Amino acid sequence: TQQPIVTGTSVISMKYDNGVIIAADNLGSYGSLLRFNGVERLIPVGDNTVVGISGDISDMQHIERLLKDLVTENAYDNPLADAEEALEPSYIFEYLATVMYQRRSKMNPLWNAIIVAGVQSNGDQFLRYVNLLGVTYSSPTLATGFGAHMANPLLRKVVDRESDIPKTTVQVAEEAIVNAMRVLYYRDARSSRNFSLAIIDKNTGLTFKKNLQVENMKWDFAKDIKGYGTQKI
Amino acid sequence: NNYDGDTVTFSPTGRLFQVEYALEAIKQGSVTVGLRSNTHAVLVALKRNADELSSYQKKIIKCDEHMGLSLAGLAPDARVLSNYLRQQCNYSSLVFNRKLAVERAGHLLCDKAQKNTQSYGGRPYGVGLLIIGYDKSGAHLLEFQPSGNVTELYGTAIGARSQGAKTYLERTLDTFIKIDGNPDELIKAGVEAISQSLRDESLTVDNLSIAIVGKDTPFTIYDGEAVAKYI
Amino acid sequence: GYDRALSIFSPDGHIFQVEYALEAVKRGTCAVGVKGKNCVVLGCERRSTLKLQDTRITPSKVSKIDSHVVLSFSGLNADSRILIEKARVEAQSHRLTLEDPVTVEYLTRYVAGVQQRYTQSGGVRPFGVSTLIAGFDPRDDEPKLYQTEPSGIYSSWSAQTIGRNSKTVREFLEKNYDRKEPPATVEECVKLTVRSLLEVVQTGAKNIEITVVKPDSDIVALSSEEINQYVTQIEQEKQE
Amino acid sequence: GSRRYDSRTTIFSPEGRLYQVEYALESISHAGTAIGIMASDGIVLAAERKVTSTLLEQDTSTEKLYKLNDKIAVAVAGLTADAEILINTARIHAQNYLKTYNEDIPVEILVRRLSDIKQGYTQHGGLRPFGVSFIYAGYDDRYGYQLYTSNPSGNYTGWKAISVGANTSAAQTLLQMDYKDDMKVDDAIELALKTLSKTTDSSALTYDRLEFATIRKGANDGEVYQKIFKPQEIKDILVKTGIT
Amino acid sequence: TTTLAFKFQHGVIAAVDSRASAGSYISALRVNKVIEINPYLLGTMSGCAADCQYWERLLAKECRLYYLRNGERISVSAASKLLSNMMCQYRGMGLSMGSMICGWDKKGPGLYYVDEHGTRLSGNMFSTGSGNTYAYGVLDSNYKWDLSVEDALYLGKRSILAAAHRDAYSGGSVNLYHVTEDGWIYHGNHDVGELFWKVKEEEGSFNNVIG
Amino acid sequence: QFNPYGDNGGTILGIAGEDFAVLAGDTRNITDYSINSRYEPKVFDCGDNIVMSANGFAADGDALVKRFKNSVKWYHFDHNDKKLSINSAARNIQHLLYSRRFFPYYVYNIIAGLDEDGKGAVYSFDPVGSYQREQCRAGGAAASLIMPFLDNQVNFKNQYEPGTNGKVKKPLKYLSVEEVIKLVRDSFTSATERHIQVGDGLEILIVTKDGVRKEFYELKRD
Amino acid sequence: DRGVSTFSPEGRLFQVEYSLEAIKLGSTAIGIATKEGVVLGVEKRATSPLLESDSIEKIVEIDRHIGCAMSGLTADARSMIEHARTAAVTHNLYYDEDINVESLTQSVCDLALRFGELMSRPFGVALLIAGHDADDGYQLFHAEPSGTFYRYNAKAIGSGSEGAQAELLNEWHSSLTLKEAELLVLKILKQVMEEKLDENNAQLSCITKQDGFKIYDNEKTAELIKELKEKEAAE
Amino acid sequence: MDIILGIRVQDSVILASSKAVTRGISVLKDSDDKTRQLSPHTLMSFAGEAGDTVQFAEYIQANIQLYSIREDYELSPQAVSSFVRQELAKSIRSRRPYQVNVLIGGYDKKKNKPELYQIDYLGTKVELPYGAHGYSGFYTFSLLDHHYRPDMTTEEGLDLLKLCVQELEKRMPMDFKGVIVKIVDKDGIRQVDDF
Ligand SMILES: *[C@@](C)(CO)[C@](*)(O)[C@H](Cc1ccccc1)NC(=O)[C@H](Cc1c[nH]c2ccccc12)NC(=O)[C@@H](C)NC(=O)CN1CCOCC1
Numbered sequence A: 001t002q003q004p005i006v007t008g009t010s011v012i013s014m015k016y017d018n019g020v021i022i023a024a025d026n027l028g029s030y031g032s033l034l035r036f037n038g039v040e041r042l043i044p045v046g047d048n049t050v051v052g053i054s055g056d057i058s059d060m061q062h063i064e065r066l067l068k069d070l071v072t073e074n075a076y077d078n079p080l081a082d083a084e085e086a087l088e089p090s091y092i093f094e095y096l097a098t099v100m101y102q103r104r105s106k107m108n109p110l111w112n113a114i115i116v117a118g119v120q121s122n123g124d125q126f127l128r129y130v131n132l133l134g135v136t137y138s139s140p141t142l143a144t145g146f147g148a149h150m151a152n153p154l155l156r157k158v159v160d161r162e163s164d165i166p167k168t169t170v171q172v173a174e175e176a177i178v179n180a181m182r183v184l185y186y187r188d189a190r191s192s193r194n195f196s197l198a199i200i201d202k203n204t205g206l207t208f209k210k211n212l213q214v215e216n217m218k219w220d221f222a223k224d225i226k227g228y229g230t231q232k233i
Numbered sequence B: 001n002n003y004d005g006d007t008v009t010f011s012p013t014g015r016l017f018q019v020e021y022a023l024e025a026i027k028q029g030s031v032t033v034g035l036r037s038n039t040h041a042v043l044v045a046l047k048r049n050a051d052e053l054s055s056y057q058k059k060i061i062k063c064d065e066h067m068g069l070s071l072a073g074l075a076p077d078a079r080v081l082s083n084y085l086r087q088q089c090n091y092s093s094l095v096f097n098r099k100l101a102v103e104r105a106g107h108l109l110c111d112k113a114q115k116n117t118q119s120y121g122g123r124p125y126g127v128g129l130l131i132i133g134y135d136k137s138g139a140h141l142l143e144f145q146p147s148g149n150v151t152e153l154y155g156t157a158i159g160a161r162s163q164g165a166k167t168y169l170e171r172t173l174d175t176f177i178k179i180d181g182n183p184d185e186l187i188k189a190g191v192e193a194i195s196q197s198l199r200d201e202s203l204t205v206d207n208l209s210i211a212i213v214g215k216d217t218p219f220t221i222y223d224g225e226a227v228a229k230y231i
Numbered sequence C: 001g002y003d004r005a006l007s008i009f010s011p012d013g014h015i016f017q018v019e020y021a022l023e024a025v026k027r028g029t030c031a032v033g034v035k036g037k038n039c040v041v042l043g044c045e046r047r048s049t050l051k052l053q054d055t056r057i058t059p060s061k062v063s064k065i066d067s068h069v070v071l072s073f074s075g076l077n078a079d080s081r082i083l084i085e086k087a088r089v090e091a092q093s094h095r096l097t098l099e100d101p102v103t104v105e106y107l108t109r110y111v112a113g114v115q116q117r118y119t120q121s122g123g124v125r126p127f128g129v130s131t132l133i134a135g136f137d138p139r140d141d142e143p144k145l146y147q148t149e150p151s152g153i154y155s156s157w158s159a160q161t162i163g164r165n166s167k168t169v170r171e172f173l174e175k176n177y178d179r180k181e182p183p184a185t186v187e188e189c190v191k192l193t194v195r196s197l198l199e200v201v202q203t204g205a206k207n208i209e210i211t212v213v214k215p216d217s218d219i220v221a222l223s224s225e226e227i228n229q230y231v232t233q234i235e236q237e238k239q240e
Numbered sequence D: 001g002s003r004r005y006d007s008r009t010t011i012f013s014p015e016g017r018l019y020q021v022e023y024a025l026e027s028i029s030h031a032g033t034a035i036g037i038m039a040s041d042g043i044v045l046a047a048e049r050k051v052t053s054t055l056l057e058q059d060t061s062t063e064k065l066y067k068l069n070d071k072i073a074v075a076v077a078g079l080t081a082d083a084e085i086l087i088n089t090a091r092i093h094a095q096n097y098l099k100t101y102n103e104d105i106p107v108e109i110l111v112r113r114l115s116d117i118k119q120g121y122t123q124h125g126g127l128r129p130f131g132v133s134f135i136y137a138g139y140d141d142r143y144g145y146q147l148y149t150s151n152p153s154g155n156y157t158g159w160k161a162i163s164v165g166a167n168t169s170a171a172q173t174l175l176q177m178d179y180k181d182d183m184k185v186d187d188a189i190e191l192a193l194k195t196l197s198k199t200t201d202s203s204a205l206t207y208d209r210l211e212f213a214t215i216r217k218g219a220n221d222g223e224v225y226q227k228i229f230k231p232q233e234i235k236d237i238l239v240k241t242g243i244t
Numbered sequence E: 001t002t003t004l005a006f007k008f009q010h011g012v013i014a015a016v017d018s019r020a021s022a023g024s025y026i027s028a029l030r031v032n033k034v035i036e037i038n039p040y041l042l043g044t045m046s047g048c049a050a051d052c053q054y055w056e057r058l059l060a061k062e063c064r065l066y067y068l069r070n071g072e073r074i075s076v077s078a079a080s081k082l083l084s085n086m087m088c089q090y091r092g093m094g095l096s097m098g099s100m101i102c103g104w105d106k107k108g109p110g111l112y113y114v115d116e117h118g119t120r121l122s123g124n125m126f127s128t129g130s131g132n133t134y135a136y137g138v139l140d141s142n143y144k145w146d147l148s149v150e151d152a153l154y155l156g157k158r159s160i161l162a163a164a165h166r167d168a169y170s171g172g173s174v175n176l177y178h179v180t181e182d183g184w185i186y187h188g189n190h191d192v193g194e195l196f197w198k199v200k201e202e203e204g205s206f207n208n209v210i211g
Numbered sequence F: 001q002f003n004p005y006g007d008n009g010g011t012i013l014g015i016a017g018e019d020f021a022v023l024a025g026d027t028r029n030i031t032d033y034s035i036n037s038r039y040e041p042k043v044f045d046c047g048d049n050i051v052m053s054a055n056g057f058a059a060d061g062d063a064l065v066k067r068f069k070n071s072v073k074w075y076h077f078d079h080n081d082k083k084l085s086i087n088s089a090a091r092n093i094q095h096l097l098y099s100r101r102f103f104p105y106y107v108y109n110i111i112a113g114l115d116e117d118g119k120g121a122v123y124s125f126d127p128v129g130s131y132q133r134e135q136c137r138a139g140g141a142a143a144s145l146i147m148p149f150l151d152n153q154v155n156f157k158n159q160y161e162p163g164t165n166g167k168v169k170k171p172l173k174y175l176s177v178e179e180v181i182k183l184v185r186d187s188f189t190s191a192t193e194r195h196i197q198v199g200d201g202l203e204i205l206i207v208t209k210d211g212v213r214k215e216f217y218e219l220k221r222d
Numbered sequence G: 001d002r003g004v005s006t007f008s009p010e011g012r013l014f015q016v017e018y019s020l021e022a023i024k025l026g027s028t029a030i031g032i033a034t035k036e037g038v039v040l041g042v043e044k045r046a047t048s049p050l051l052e053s054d055s056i057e058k059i060v061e062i063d064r065h066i067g068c069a070m071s072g073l074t075a076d077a078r079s080m081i082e083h084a085r086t087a088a089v090t091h092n093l094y095y096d097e098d099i100n101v102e103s104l105t106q107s108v109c110d111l112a113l114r115f116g117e118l119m120s121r122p123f124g125v126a127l128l129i130a131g132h133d134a135d136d137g138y139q140l141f142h143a144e145p146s147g148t149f150y151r152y153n154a155k156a157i158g159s160g161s162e163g164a165q166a167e168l169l170n171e172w173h174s175s176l177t178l179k180e181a182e183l184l185v186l187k188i189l190k191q192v193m194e195e196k197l198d199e200n201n202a203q204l205s206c207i208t209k210q211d212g213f214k215i216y217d218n219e220k221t222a223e224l225i226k227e228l229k230e231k232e233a234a235e
Numbered sequence H: 001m002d003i004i005l006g007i008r009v010q011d012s013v014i015l016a017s018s019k020a021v022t023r024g025i026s027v028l029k030d031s032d033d034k035t036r037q038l039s040p041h042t043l044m045s046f047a048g049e050a051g052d053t054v055q056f057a058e059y060i061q062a063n064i065q066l067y068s069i070r071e072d073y074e075l076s077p078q079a080v081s082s083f084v085r086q087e088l089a090k091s092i093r094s095r096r097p098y099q100v101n102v103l104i105g106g107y108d109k110k111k112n113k114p115e116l117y118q119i120d121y122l123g124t125k126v127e128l129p130y131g132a133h134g135y136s137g138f139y140t141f142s143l144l145d146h147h148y149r150p151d152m153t154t155e156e157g158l159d160l161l162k163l164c165v166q167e168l169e170k171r172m173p174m175d176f177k178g179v180i181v182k183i184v185d186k187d188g189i190r191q192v193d194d195f
């Protein structure tokens, strides 16, 4: 049993017709202090999987190393490591989910919420969540922390059910994700303007975008707001 | 001679006699044949009885839905090794949601057998195994020796008089590899192969044991009247 | 730990260490067990090579395992103490977990199991001891007499002997003991037990020990004079 | 592996004997003779030190006679170092019993415990047995005065008079001849010394070649006293009995 | 729950209710609170349902092994003791199990009370569970050694009914057993709803209740 | 302090017919007031014509099902491909649950299938392993809403025959699969109305001698 | 000396082969399987007339549906029987059913090769395991110290085994009744035994679906011996 | 359990022990014997937490019976009491201590004297002419202080014991369902069937 110290906030994601999108801001908070401003919380595994992690950063760095070692170990005595016997998103997720549930069962959890996003061998989209309790679920849209409360409602307007996935393009899905990240910047006190975004498409592969910023923000209406009720000046 | 008392002793010519003696137990064992195409993999095994009142010792063991082996030599040692394979196949599924690659299964068997050849007190395994399976890279056939050596092959045979079946497969190489999408013809080639190792006795209904795995075919074993079709 | 396999098979299918343990039993002093109609008697030889002995304190050959069961032996004396101790512990352990005292058959089965365990355990040698276990089951008036040996086999006997010159006294018992009509009284049972030992013992002085066990935990050891009276009567009938 | 060099100390011979126990007894037969004699009013322990030197410090020396507690003592025959291992264990067992039951340990119970330890080395562990034979002299309120002996086999027996070590065959014959049941301590003292004087391999029996001890109720009223004799006191009892 | 068991002339009676609770919610109307360990041994259940089932089914394993080794049926005294020894290993760990071990052996009929503390009591009459006080009232005033099998079966049945009525956590149905030297005998499942009205009319009791 | 348990909501329902059995459950997965998934399967085909569902804490539920499926696999290996009967599966699951008596699988478990005489069977478990064969059982969040309805409409409790006025009960006529599915759908529709953790979807698994069949129905998403 | 788990140049484990020689010295045990049941019979072979023969327990119950006969160093069999009984009852605890005869036999045979430098040597006893289950019906297995087990229609083990096995070769057919099998075991036991066969130095037993495993009374066996003598004198 | 009393007179030791056993709000048994014979001339009564009492008593009994068989000799009451004390003093610092208080009444055949030892669950041993555990002493010791002599007969000891039980029955809130009385003397242990 511990408590989280340096933390990362929401990770948001969704499926679209040909793949998945995942995003997360670059902040490492120390309570209310916005201590670290250059933290990457999206971690690619091969060219077909991206793991997005929220929660304790020291535990995130531990998981990052487990995945790096997983790739190394998979290549051992494996001539087809870059082909048929490469790591799949479902393999990577189940490994993490096994680890997360074992750690909670020893009462020494990895204080994280993880979303594994990727595309399988057969072109199928993979998107599944796992947390410190070992709880797992899948949905067309997934989000951690505040994203669950604010992002999912917006992303579910685009993909409300499974039949909406083929109708959703990558341009529409990215637009929705970027809008959700703006909303989180307005309303999440432990968020940052700077974020990273990753797209895993079955045709165009893995596109990893860094140093993105929230833009087109509405603040002008603040000038008219005066006092807390009766004040006019 | 003086260097065969245990597995921890090299001979002056660099030989391990206890391992060689374990290899001898395989040669005494009943014949079993393995062969594959691009779509399917087949095991054919001649079962042996104690006498006319006795049953015919089972030769083939299932390890997973997509993998299994046939044995020749000490049957209990095959039970230990097959049990290990079952666990490893199962660990791969439960932890990684991943079917165990046949090549990796061979590497695990090699490493398990090796530990018994370098340590004092223990002994080498006294059994040879033919592992067949279908994974993400298609059909596979492996030959396991208790020295630790594992070999991926198109076809092979182990046991008494196994040289006859092995020569046949070496001639038929170009034919049986092309038998794709036809399980019955691949088994026929296996039954015809194991027939080259028979003397005096012939293939009867409770004598013959066949197993198959493939693209849309789980590892299944055929015994009794289920193999009368191929006699 | 010391794990060396001492008891192993030989090419002819023998476990020599177990067989050599029987030779230690052959060397041991003679012990005899005879069951009558309502009792069991245990006779034991005392070799008279050892005089100046203190018979008060010297370990007696017959040992109580519980209030209703006794154990005598032939072979290595030191080895027998270990079996007796284990047996006594098991007897109290049975009373504690099952609320009944052990049956004679159960106690025998346990002691025999201990002997067997020492024939296929690493780092240990077999017990050089054969035992005669006698007594009466709780609330039962049928006599019980069992024998065990180093290999771990056990069986029930109408009458039996073990130890040195046991071949001779078994010869005597086989022709003298009638199954259809066993020694009806205590006297007849003791007399037959002393007679059998007199075939082997030498002098009938302090060389013969007798212990009578009757039903309902009634166990007593005869004294020198009481036994001497049997010795006197036997030979006076023999002079004819 | 290691098997090659294993002597296998805990096995039977074809005749049903324990090799190492028999060879340990052979070792003990070359050790200095120790004698124990039990009387109605006490016990005597006598023992011969092995070929000593003039430069050996005798008054601070102890190789034969050891104290286990206030009521029990032992005479040693064999490897002294082996005996001290066992003696310290026996001293601890006596104190464990006293702590548990608040009563001094009965002599036989202590003897059985040591004998059981010796037995263990003959049946398991693969170690050599202790090359030691003890004579136990002790007193308790159940059986009174008691003499026991134990040997490397772990077998123990009770005695009226007994010898261990060298020339026990000759010594036992002499004791069997002159011993009587109504004997007293002062007489037993004389018998012990006379027996050693005749069985000794030395030219003459002197004070510097002896260790001596008595366990007497010759203590003021109902209680028991242990007396480990000093060199000068052994010299006096040798003159008194008429040996020197 | 309410369970009872009592010795008498013609063996031992065992009667139990059938309710199961999850706080105020009645989770089961008809659970089996008796285990047929062997043809001559019964076990009642009160407390944690899981503990009662696990440990008494494990007791049955141990009682069968006794028969195989000794070629003889286990006594009620020995069976009850094995169970109490199990409880003592998990002493303080939080088990909740109250049970009567009923049977017939060489000493005649036998009845032992065993609980999670390792308590083991021999006696002629016992009752366990939340509604045992109500059952004791009926039992104590009507029990005799000279009872007929028919009257004894009714007494145990009526005693559970008394508890099922007043105790909120007791009811559903009544399960009857009669243990003889030829073995135990099941005497049916009796719905309390139907039994209550039947007893009220025939016996005249429960005058306070309107029917 | 770290709390190793959680509540993922959901509700499950098992009904035994004369020659069939159903195991139904909603597809909604939740934490607190949030929805994790609107379609997260909860009822599984475990092989040998057995269906299973562990309702409560999803992580413990997935682990148990995973272990039982594994137990079926090893039952075939060890006992010559013998079919695991429903009564044998139930007993096996009791021991799986009691292995964690002092750190329980926080789930309510139901399995369904056919007994060895071909009749419909449902078995019910508590988190620590007490089990029983039942004709009818609802488990989970809305269990207390549904069970009384099933006592009334499946076992005809408190129902009597008109004209007799309480003297003669309603006879216990058997129910068809079509009739049972109606009661299942009405049970979940009613539970969805009054319970916030129930909704989104309903997945039913029907077991007969022919095999395991699935049926899916939408539920209210509010 | 040499390892306990050592292979010979022929590819056999020395100790396993030597334990088989000990089994050849053991008293005879015979098993015959029919569609009406399986019969198990043994030679008691008392070493002396004073030995109470009814205490010789070479036929043993494992479960209600499984029986067992032994030959060789019979003391070694006690822990095997204990394991078998535990395995049978434990499976009944875990699965609420009878355990398959083959599965029970396999569990016993798993102990066999657990020896090295675990126990210090192989078992010096062979077992005939007979039983019935719903899947494969009436079965007879021969469990060796090698860890191998063969199923048999009929089997003899012990000192008179090869002579008895040749006789069982000629006599066995698939339509044997239980009564015919009983007499056949008695016939072959009488042929290979040193002493004259009677109810006190030989024992019969059987396993049927209805009544389960039963050891025969000396009075019941005595009648079957008398029935045998008369039918042999009949031609 | 509740009340256990002990008194040592001229030639015997008398132990009185309550008969009640209570689970929850219900008295399950009113004839319970809270005692075990350790040896022919040594009796131990006990009281404490449920289960622990009998377990501990039976464990002690088994150990003393084992000693008796091994040595063919009866341990003195003093020796047995010291063994029991050590087991309790060992127990108090264990993971889960045994919560048992005992009285040990024995007749020493060597000294021809009765002996009463009081030992609590901590391992606190005291030899006494009369003793009790729990609240029993609060009511009874004043009577015993007044009426007790060391030259009392067994019959006088029983009469003084009746007076103690009567006082307990008057001033204790709990109904302990009377007492089972046992006498330990040179001839062994016997129970007074009418009290
Ligand atoms: C009265 C009803 C007391 O409430 C009985 O003792 C009853 C005894 C019993 C015995 C065997 C089987 C079933 C019932 N006990 C319970 O019903 C018991 C009471 C309870 C609840 N929490 C407890 C905590 C500690 C001790 C007792 C407790 N209830 C249960 O065990 C509940 C929690 N479990 C079930 O009802 C679940 N299983 C019931 C049978 O069907 C499978 C599910």
Ligand SMILES: [Mg+2]
Binding pocket: F191, F192, F193, F194, F195, F196, F197, F198, F199, F222
């Ligand atoms: Mg709702």
